Design a protein around this ligand. Structure first.
Ligand SMILES: [Ca+2]
Ligand code: NA
Ligand code: NA
Length: 274
């Protein structure tokens, strides 16, 4: 039987899918460690690998497969169910087996995705500094119409210190923080002016190699809920610009408290996709 992870109804993605909008023919690129394309609960239709030695459609880490499943686990009678389970899923390998990557590998994946006409780019990765090329790449992708979503960071809070990492920190990317099943901010979730919305990030169960399902914590689990939400919204209003999709998710989110810790709050896709 299929389990429905708590995050799906909490962002009310299940309400949108019942209307019949499921992300169909929206293209989503997952820029991560790759995806276990053979997993029975995922359909990967293309991608590219910027990591030496590894093909795009395998994932020795697990991280990219788990993030993909949150976006797009197939709607069927097994495994889990993704936020936008009818999306066209692309695996863009920019991180190695140990979950790490270079700026130029990352820049390359972003450019591959803009060039190959992705509608949404999910980046569940971050670092303390970013680079000149990365900034140009996210900015060029957003200006061409791509919705760009990244994990805010798992650095917690500490006084007034901004802990949002890059590429989340760039103005052209949606910085996603993490809440738990009770919709409370998870402790590891980074904080700062740039934080923009919150999604489920603690206790997220999804696809995981080999052919199984596992629970992870991090803003990395939060980011794809928003990438899936972007895809549902486009599946329902195909002509919105990236900017309008971003605004819908932003302005209709459930207020949780101070923006520094929560941004505009928890995403509500039923309200965003109205
Ligand atoms: Ca399934
Ligand atoms: Na598969
Ligand atoms: Na940002």
């Amino acid at each position: 039987a299929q389990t429905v992870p708590y995050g799906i109804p909490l962002i009310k993605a299940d309400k949108v899918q019942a209307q019949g909008f499921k992300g169909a023919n929206v293209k989503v690129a997952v820029l991560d460690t790759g995806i276990q394309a053979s997993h029975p609960d995922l359909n990967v239709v293309g991608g590219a690998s910027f990591v030496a030695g590894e093909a795009y459609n395998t994932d020795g880490n697990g991280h990219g497969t788990h993030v993909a499943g949150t976006v797009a686990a197939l709607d069927n009678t097994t495994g889990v169910l993704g936020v936008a389970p009818s999306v066209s899923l692309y695996a863009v390998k920019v991180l190695n087996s140990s979950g790490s990557g270079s700026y130029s590998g990352i820049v390359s994946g972003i450019e591959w995705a803009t060039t190959n006409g992705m509608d949404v780019i999910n980046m569940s990765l971050g670092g303390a500094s970013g680079s000149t090329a990365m900034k140009q790449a996210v900015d060029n992708a957003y200006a061409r119409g791509v919705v760009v979503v990244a994990a805010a960071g798992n650095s917690g809070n500490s006084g007034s210190t901004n802990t949002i990492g890059y590429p989340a920190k760039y103005d052209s990317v949606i910085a996603v923080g993490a809440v738990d099943s009770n919709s409370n901010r998870a402790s590891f979730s980074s904080v700062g002016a740039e934080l923009e919305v919150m999604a489920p990030g603690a206790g997220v169960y999804s696809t995981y190699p080999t052919n199984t399902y596992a629970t992870l914590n991090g803003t990395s689990m939060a980011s794809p809920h928003v990438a899936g939400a972007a895809a549902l919204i486009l599946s329902k209003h195909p002509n919105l610009s990236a900017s309008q999709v971003r605004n819908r998710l932003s302005s209709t989110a459930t207020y949780l408290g101070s923006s520094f810790y929560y941004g505009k709050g928890l995403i509500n896709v039923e309200a965003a996709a109205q």
